[PDB]
Structure formats: structure tokens, C-alpha cells
Amino acid sequence: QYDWDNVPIPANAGAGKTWKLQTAASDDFNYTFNPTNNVVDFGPNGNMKWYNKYHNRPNGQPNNFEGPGPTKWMQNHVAVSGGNLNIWASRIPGATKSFTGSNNTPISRPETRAGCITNKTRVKYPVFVEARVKVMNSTLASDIWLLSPDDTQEIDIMECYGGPGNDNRNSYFASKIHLSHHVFIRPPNFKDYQPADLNSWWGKNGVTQWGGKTIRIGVNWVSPTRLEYFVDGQMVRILDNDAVQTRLADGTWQYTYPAGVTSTGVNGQLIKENGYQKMNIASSLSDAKNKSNISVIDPFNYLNNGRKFSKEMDIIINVEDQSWQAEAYRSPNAAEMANFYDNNLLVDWIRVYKPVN
């Protein structure tokens, strides 16, 4: 028996097919794992389902990247207890961290210590991954995501800065969940693409903040070229090759596709409108796909692979103080950090299925 037994799988396995639970990957977090400074595997009974660090390199060696912005990932900021995975953030008085700011020069902010874990079982399309999670009531990022070992391909389940802040400085972002993915060129020619259309910042009328709410959120990774997103059992977004459909604030579907880019090669940039990727309106997903000539996966050919996902991925859950938030002082302040509950991400369960006939 599992915590999710009574919860319908919202993704469609397809005609003639059903969903098969991926037992080793899935975890309903009902055991005890006490936090430790050591890098260790953890799980129920004898099982090793996770380790308390950012994901290893393809060769198995540690990846010692400590996080974006002024984040420092810390082994002992991860525990399992009370039926939940707990991943939290804290600060040490006087501790600071430098990172490259928006002017391509170093800047410093208070260092945010935070947990980060990686699942020992990788996933690849076709696969559905869903978690039940209490989003942190914090301006920090509550993250559940997938990343290839070589750091080139990424599919996010949740990236949410759910708390408006005690002074509401993060109110604009707190009402949204970023439904996202990334593709990268690795150094030396480092480039990063993620969805920047207005509709990728998903919300719902009557929800002012996600912080403190417990939601179910998942991604159905259908194929190299298709992702579907789900919140509380409802499909809310599809990315399909070169077109997008997303549920608007009132629940109604809008079909869109990219209006323009400067190039579809590696030095290309988005044409923007109102601060977001400029998108045109279509009348169905097929109409949008017909009209579009620009990938919504890899518009600038960073992967040089037919603009598609192609690599198995590690499941990562973490908290982050990202550079853009930290530079803008949207990161937590001392008063907010006095409330532990607000700074602790709780995952009740994460389940993984693949479609089988």
C-alpha cells in the first residue's frame, strides 16, 4: 500500500495501455531518515532510493556544484520524518556568497544553506512523475525537477517561489508556478534556454500564493518532443515540439506558438512582448503546430540533436536561492528566516509510472 493508492493518475497512458508503478523510483517518505553532514544514501528499510547531494557525474564521480546564486547546498538540510521528505533552508550569521550578477560582474548576498537530493533511479520517456508537496511559504524556489547526468537536458516538474514575503516584495511571483524545462550548451560555450512565455508562469483565479499550499504536481514526459503538466489532477499545460497549450487563469485553454526569434541557431534570441517571449494565438494544438516554425523545446539548437529530449534524467528535489531573486533582494530576510515552518519544503510522496500495454 502507498499514500497515492487512492489518487487517480491524471495523465493518459493511451488506448490499450495502463500505468505501471516504477517501484524503485517511487517513494511515499513514511520512514525515518535523520539528517547528517555525511553524503549518504537513504530510503525505507534497506532500500537506497536517494542520496542527500546534487547529482553525480555520468562517470559516477561527485558533482560538487553547490548551487545557483548565493545558494550553498548542504547534506544535513535533508531528512525524512512525519510522513514527509523535509528539505529546508537556513542562514549562518555573517556568511555570504558571491555570484555573477546581471551586469556580468560579481556581487555578494547572504549565503542560503539548502538541501538537495538525487533519486538513484533515472527516468526517461515515456514516464510520468508526480509529487504531493507543500510549497514553501518562502521567496526561495521550491524545486522538483529532472536533469540529465551530463547537465545538457532538463525537464522541470515544479519551480515555484511561493511566498510573497513578509513585505510582499515577491507577490508577483508567489501566485505562479513556473512550468518549465531547460536545454544547455555546456562550457565553454555556455548557453541556457527555458520557457519564457507569459503562459509558462501558470496560475489560477483565487490563488494569491502557492506558498504554504499542498498541491499535487507532475509531468508526463510523453516523447522526445512532448511534455504535459498537471496540478491537482488537472492537465494545465502541453509543450509539443513547436506549440504550446495552457490553461488560463479561468481554466480555459489557450493555444499558442512562438511569434519570432532572431535565429534558430545557437546565437538566436527571443523576440519579446510585454517582457515575455512573444507568442501568437492559434485555435487548437494542431493549428499551432501547423503555424509554428520555431521549437518550444530547443529554439536555438543548443542540443544539436533535432531539438528534442534524448537523454535519461536524474530526479532532483531541492530548494534554491537563485541569482535573479537574490540580486533583486527578493530572497528571504532575517525576520522570515525566524519562522522555520515557512522555510521547509515538505514532500508527502513522489510517484513514477510508465505506460505499458
Residues within the annotated binding site for substrate? 74-84, 103-105, 154, 159, 186, 320
83 binds Ca ion (CB under 5 A): yes
Closest CB to Ca ion among 85 and 179? 85
- Give the list of residues 6+ apart from residue 352 with CB closer than 8 angstroms, or none: 21, 22, 25, 26, 121, 123, 127, 128, 129, 315
Binding part of the chain for Ca ion, among 3-11, 139-147, 193-201, 322-330 by CB under 5 A, reads 3-11
Active-site residue flag, 154: yes
Which of 2, 3, 44, 124: binder of Ca ion (CB under 5 A)?
3
Site for Ca ion in 336-355 (CB under 5 A): 348-349
Compute the Cα dihedral for 320, 325, 329, 330 and give only its sign: negative
Site string for Ca ion, 174-193 (x = CB under 5 A): --------------------
Task: For cell 555525511, name the residue.
Answer: 38
Considering only residues 30 through 69, tell me which ones interact with Ca ion, judged by CB under 5 A.
30
Stretch that binds Ca ion, among 1-9, 111-119, 146-154, 297-305 (CB under 5 A): 1-9
What's CA 276's distance to the chain center, in Å? Answer: 19
From the list 159, 228, 327, 336, the catalytic residue is 159
Which secondary-structure segment (H or E) carries 178?
strand 177-178
Q: ω into residue 93 within 30 of 0, thus cis?
A: no
Q: What is the footprint of Ca ion within residues 6-35 (CB under 5 A)? A: 28-30
Q: What share of the chain is helix, strand, coil (3-state, %, to 5)?
A: 10, 40, 50
Segment interacting with Ca ion, rule: CB under 5 A, options 37-45, 64-72, 79-87, 162-170: 79-87
> What's the min distance (Å) between Cβ of 80 and Ca ion?
9
Cis geometry, peptide bond prior to residue 8 (ω within 30 degrees of 0): no
**Structural contact between residues 247 and 237, judged by C-beta atoms closer than 8 angstroms:** yes
Cell 550548451 -> residue: 185
Residue 84 Cβ vs Ca ion, minimum distance, rounded to whole Å: 6
Residue nearest to Ca ion (CB): 83
Q: Would you tell me which residues interact with Ca ion (CB under 5 A)?
A: 3, 28-30, 83, 348-349
